[PDB]
Request: fold
Amino acid sequence: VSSLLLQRLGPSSGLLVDWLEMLDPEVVSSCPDLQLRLLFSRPSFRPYLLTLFTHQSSWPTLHQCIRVLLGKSREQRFDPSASLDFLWACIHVPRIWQGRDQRTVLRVQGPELISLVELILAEAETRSQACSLIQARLPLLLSCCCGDDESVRKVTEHLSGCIQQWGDSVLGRRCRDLLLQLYLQRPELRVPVPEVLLHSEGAASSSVCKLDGLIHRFITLLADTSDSRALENRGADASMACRKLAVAHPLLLLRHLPMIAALLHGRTHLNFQEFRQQNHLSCFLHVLGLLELLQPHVFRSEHQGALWDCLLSFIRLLLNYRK
Amino acid sequence: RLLLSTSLDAKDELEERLERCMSIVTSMTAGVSEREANDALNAYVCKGLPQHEEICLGLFTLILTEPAQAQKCYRDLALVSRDGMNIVLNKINQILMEKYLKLQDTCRTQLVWLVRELVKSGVLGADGVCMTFMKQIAGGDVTAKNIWLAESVLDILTEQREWVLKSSILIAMAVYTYLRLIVDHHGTAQLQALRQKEVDFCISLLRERFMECLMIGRDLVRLLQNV
Amino acid sequence: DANSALMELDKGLRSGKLGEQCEAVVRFPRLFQKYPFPILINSAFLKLADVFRVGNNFLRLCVLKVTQQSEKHLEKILNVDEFVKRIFSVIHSNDPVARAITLRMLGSLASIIPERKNAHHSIRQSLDSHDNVEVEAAVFAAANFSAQSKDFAVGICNKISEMIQGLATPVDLKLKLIPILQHMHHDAILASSARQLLQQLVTSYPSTKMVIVSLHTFTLLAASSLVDTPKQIQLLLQYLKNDPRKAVKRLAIQ
Amino acid sequence: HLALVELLKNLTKYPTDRDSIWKCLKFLGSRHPTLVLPLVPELLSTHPFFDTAEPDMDDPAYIAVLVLIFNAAKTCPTMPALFSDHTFRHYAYLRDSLSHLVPA
Amino acid sequence: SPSYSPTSPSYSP
Amino acid sequence: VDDWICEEEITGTDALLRRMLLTNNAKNHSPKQLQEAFSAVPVNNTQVMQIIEHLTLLSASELIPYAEVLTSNMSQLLNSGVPRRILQTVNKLWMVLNTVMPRRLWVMTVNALQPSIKFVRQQKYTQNDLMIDPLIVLRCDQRVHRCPPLMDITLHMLNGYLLASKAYLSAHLKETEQTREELKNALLAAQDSAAVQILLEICLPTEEEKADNLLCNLREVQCLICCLLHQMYIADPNIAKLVHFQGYPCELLPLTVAGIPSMHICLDFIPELIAQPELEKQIFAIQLLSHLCIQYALPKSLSVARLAVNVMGTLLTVLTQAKRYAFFMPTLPSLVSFCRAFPPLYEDIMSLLIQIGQVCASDVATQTRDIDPIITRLQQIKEKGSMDPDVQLCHCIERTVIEIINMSVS
Reply:
């Protein structure tokens, strides 16, 4: 039956698929190589057999399939799309998550993770001829890495090596996109990542950083101040943390530049006496120092508009209180 | 007004609550057909809890107002009550044992009709209403209206003796109270027939529920010796 | 009297003991038969919805049975808003069985309350849950609402397309999901999109059960929407001449 | 903030104007995206560490606030990160029900 | 109230 | 309600497949043929697969003859290498039979799932036998504990027989009247709690499983048992209170808190559980509260966490040295969870940690020790020992502070 299915076929394929299902209930149990070739290769009935094998095979069988999919890593035979879908389905089997309410986790080895990330990159490469599919597949990588710092660092340095190898190829471009998405998803790493992503324009993508809300909190604390010296101490601590994040992770702050630009726009009208008494000059010098410490990156094209907004606020302040 | 009083009588805040209930229940109806009236009424009831209680008390007061309106508003209350009107029955008990000294005769008759309807329908908690209404009968008095009220509630209890049977403590309360009324009442042929009815009912209860009459106490013998 | 019987039945509902409660609940449709008075029906259904909200699961299922049986009487409901609101509150319960019973309740009530967006969102949410009972209830409710509503039909058509194309769904749930598409006859473009989806289904799922279900659903859709009947007949004849399976041929005959 | 508060008072006074006010908040968010998102955690009332109770869906004022927030978030990429899970759920609900108001 | 999560909407009558 | 809602029409596709496939007159599949297919010397999964797959189409009324063969041979399904679909379809057919033929199906199913080393193993487990002692259904072959379909079967059986036993002994005490009601309620509470405890112990990974791999049959069985316990807790939260007062192995606490959404009610009685005399109950209360605070970070949760911190600080100066060690070794990993839930607890958590660290350091200084942690005051980080209690407790304090600082800092 498998030999017939591998080889035009006509609608008779349904009968063969039914026979394969009924006489070999656990797909890939007997003669595993033929079924692995059927499910993953380089076709019309593929999703049905994939669904059968996903929801109908014992857990050791699924584990063995995962091992042989990510094991050899130098076959170039298994389709990236099918393998990624199969892994994502295996993670989200309804039996494993039965009784949950879907509110706020598997471990894999090093080489298996390297194979998986290379498979994601291959999927991105065949998709290229935007970053949508990379972000679509990225939750699987985060789930498999299981928040393991060493594993994430290993993936980061491997992707850095891949970018160094390709340079600016299509594979290099998708490696840069995946690396920047992973860095946004895992910014807790002390490394700010090499210059390769400092040249890319992926910072404006429809992506959510794991640290953006927190720097938003701190920048609100920085901007919002009154005559209180306690609030001034709070703003000084906020400037300290924001400055340390600027020197450490400059790209993250620049994504929040239009926000602080709008705040600067808002605060400019107030006359000089209340401006000095409310300590708004402290906020102005803090944001000016922060912009200075974001020196070689704030001049990019993407940050140009909010930069001009901030400079407009500064010059408006200079004109209004020139006395 | 509803309760008899004069200018010097204190402005009773409970009665003002009743007046506000009159206002909301009547002005919301606006003499429209019962269909849209109960639709809007249910909307207002389900808006919240205090307005639900206000609507229930307005329906209760309307039951004490006029016969046809009492029928229609009791229908609407049975249709729209959410919790079965248990706290409404509690407020009925409070209004009863507090304001019975000033209750008008027509309101008394319509309240008795409501009590009979509740007992016949078997609404939960009616035993409390029965025993608190029973408590208001003053012993050693021969006023015609009080005796008529006693006879009316006696008739209610006699027709619904099974409802007394399923209410264990009410058997003891009723038999003791009717023995006290028996030793109180005598003098006229109508009172003689009333005496016959009371003694027949009490003997039937005592024989059929001797085990339940055990917990009345030694004062049962005290009532027995006089009769 | 109607009201006398109603409240005499109601006191059973308040009894606390489950036997009397379910007895009263299943006694309700007979009372509707005796008294088709919209005032009484409205009040009785409000009481039903209250006990459904506060009662346990078995009493909720009894109220579901009553609602399904009392189909002819529920268009005379005056306060549909409050009734469906207190019915809908149970959908937030963490208990998956209660959510399933509530979804089935909404599906039964779909005739009197279509175009209600929160109900539609509840149906759409539960369709991707993990508890199979809740998912099946969501499928049933989706069938009913798609029979009634129109915008909900195209939304569910898109969701079913991306779900069947997905790999998380098991085979049996896919079988249960396909006949939802028979209600996509609300307009021409929606029917054509459903036709493309069914063509994709028969191409990429050639086993017996789901080609059976899918081409039967296509037959019903073409029967409802007369625009695509010739191509449906042509497809049926093609499957009759080419497909070798006896069961598929016999369905083509039927 | 003053505009939103007075609009909510208007909602309480005259609820029949809810569609027009939602259009107002749509245009306010779209034309003033950067100026809104500093006010996001107060508008959603998200606590720093607690998990806030799920707001009553289908409420007028809450839908108004969400329409403003989402239309602000169409251009700005940092806005959705301050959303809780139920905020995403309500986003999906509003998007299917009020697609003409709430953008992608 | 074990059937409703504490972070679920409250049905105010 | 599960059986009744199972009967509810979903889409009507089942009726279509009934009218279509069953018309083939392949109904020659008979119980004797299925029994022969089961009793082949090789497994021969193909024939049984075809037969039971065909039986899914059969309506419930005509499926009654197949009850004997399916139940009698389900012991053979426990053997290694049985396809999943066989067990899934057996589960479906068993659910159908339960919908129409419940009581005798339960009797024969319990009789079938005996350990089989005792062979007959007292096959006289009649209807009354299980109705008096529901825990018999838990006395089953160990292989079902990692067989999710038949485990789901057993859970259905267990729930049914708990309710059945409640009604049965109520009727028995009524007819034997010719107080005892208090003994009835106590026996029922004890029986339900015992069933819950046995299920929880089933959820534990055995030594072999102990000898990562988060996707396996054990997780499936854990989900099933969590769903059943959720149903039981919704039925009566007092059973949850009784179980937690009894306590259970703390390894399950992440599992139970994550898988039982009704667990949030535990914050109501945790203050009273804290005030128990037994040290074990207080330790369990602290661990449970920590897991719940991780799960539900609520103001009431914060107040109960404050009470937990205050009682830990209080009886820090009431316990002896041995009691200090025995109490603070398990409840110290709860402090990092408290810090995760509630930042405003940093002040009190750190003050408590400093106090216990100084107490333990002085205790170390009193008696001569092996490692002498005081002189090892400038040590570095060390992530993951039969030494004496006090140095172990000092190292535990160190690790607790390491975890708190490390998570807060990143």
User: Anything to note?
Assistant: Chain C touches chain D at residues 92, 117-118, 120-121, 124-125, 155 (CB under 8 Å). The radius of gyration of chain C is 21 Å. Residues 18-34 of chain C form the longest helix (17 residues). Residues 186 and 230 of chain C are 19 Å apart (CA to CA).
